[PDB]
C-alpha cells in the first residue's frame, strides 16, 4: 500500500533526473516523510498527490513527465490505494479533478488525462466532487470535443467519455 | 475511429457487472483482441495508449475475482 507511492515517486524521479541533462526538492520530502510510517491512516492523503498535482498542473515541462505523472495518476485510482478510510479523500479528488481540467502540459497526454476524468467521474467516489470543478470538467471535455485541428480519434474518446459523464450527471436527478 | 469505438465498447462491457455473466473463451479471444491492438506499432500511438488503458482496466476487472 505505502510500497507503491515511493515506487511511483522513484520512477518520476529518475525519469525527472534523466530527463533533465523546484520539484525535486518536495518530491524527495514526499519520500522521506513516507519512508517511515507503515500505513497511510496516520496523515492526510493530499500531501502526498501533491507533488503529482503541481507538476500536472503546470506547463513549463514537456509531454514525457507529464505523461509519466498521469499515468501515476491512473495506477493511483485503479489499485484505489486513496481508499475512503483514507483522511481528507474528498479534498485530494477535489484537488485531483481542479488541477487536472487544465489541459496544458504530444495527443498522448490528451487522453490519458480524459480517459483519467472518466475513471474519477464514473466511480462512485466522483459524487464527491463539487459543481464548480465538475462544470470546469464538463468545459474541457466540451473544448477537446468541439476543436477541429486535433486528431479525429482523440475527438471520438471525448465524444465518447462525454456521453458517460452526461449518463452518470443525469442520473442524480432521483 | 471505429477501432477505437470498439475498444470503449469493450470497456463498458466488462466493467460493468455484466462481464461476471461471461465465459472464458469469449473473454479469453477480448484479450487476445487487446493484445494485438497494442501489439500493434502501424496504428497511431494514441490509439496503442486507448489499448494500454483498457488492457489496465481489464486486468483489474479479471484479477478481482480471484478474492
Same mark, same amino acid.
Given at each position: 500500500?505505502?510500497?507503491?507511492?515511493?515506487?511511483?515517486?522513484?520512477?518520476?524521479?529518475?525519469?525527472?533526473?534523466?530527463?533533465?541533462?523546484?520539484?525535486?526538492?518536495?518530491?524527495?520530502?514526499?519520500?522521506?516523510?513516507?519512508?517511515?510510517?507503515?500505513?497511510?491512516?496516520?496523515?492526510?492523503?493530499?500531501?502526498?498527490?501533491?507533488?503529482?498535482?503541481?507538476?500536472?498542473?503546470?506547463?513549463?515541462?514537456?509531454?514525457?513527465?507529464?505523461?509519466?505523472?498521469?499515468?501515476?495518476?491512473?495506477?493511483?485510482?485503479?489499485?484505489?490505494?486513496?481508499?475512503?478510510?483514507?483522511?481528507?479523500?474528498?479534498?485530494?479528488?477535489?484537488?485531483?479533478?481542479?488541477?487536472?481540467?487544465?489541459?496544458?502540459?504530444?495527443?498522448?497526454?490528451?487522453?490519458? $488525462? $480524459?480517459?483519467?476524468?472518466?475513471?474519477?467521474?464514473?466511480?462512485?467516489?466522483?459524487?464527491?466532487?463539487?459543481?464548480?470543478?465538475?462544470?470546469?470538467?464538463?468545459?474541457?471535455?466540451?473544448?477537446?470535443?468541439?476543436?477541429?485541428?486535433?486528431?479525429?480519434?482523440?475527438?471520438?474518446?471525448?465524444?465518447?467519455?462525454?456521453?458517460?459523464?452526461?449518463?452518470?450527471?443525469?442520473?442524480?436527478?432521483?
Amino acid at each position: 500500500p505505502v510500497t507503491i507511492i515511493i515506487k511511483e515517486c522513484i520512477n518520476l524521479s529518475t525519469a525527472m533526473r534523466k530527463y533533465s541533462k523546484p520539484f525535486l526538492s518536495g518530491f524527495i520530502q514526499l519520500r522521506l516523510m513516507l519512508n517511515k510510517l507503515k500505513n497511510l491512516d496516520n496523515i492526510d492523503s493530499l500531501t502526498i498527490l501533491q507533488p503529482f498535482l503541481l507538476i500536472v498542473s503546470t506547463s513549463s515541462i514537456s509531454g514525457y513527465i507529464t505523461s509519466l505523472a498521469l499515468d501515476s495518476l491512473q495506477k493511483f485510482f485503479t489499485l484505489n490505494i486513496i481508499n475512503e478510510s483514507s483522511q481528507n479523500y474528498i479534498g485530494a479528488h477535489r484537488a485531483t479533478v481542479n488541477a487536472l481540467t487544465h489541459c496544458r502540459f504530444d495527443d498522448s497526454v490528451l487522453l490519458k $488525462v $480524459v480517459f483519467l476524468l472518466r475513471s474519477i467521474v464514473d466511480s462512485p467516489y466522483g459524487d464527491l466532487l463539487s459543481n464548480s470543478i465538475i462544470y470546469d470538467v464538463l468545459q474541457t471535455i466540451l473544448s477537446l470535443a468541439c476543436n477541429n485541428r486535433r486528431s479525429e480519434v482523440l475527438r471520438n474518446a471525448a465524444q465518447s467519455t462525454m456521453i458517460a459523464v452526461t449518463v452518470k450527471i443525469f442520473s442524480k436527478l432521483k
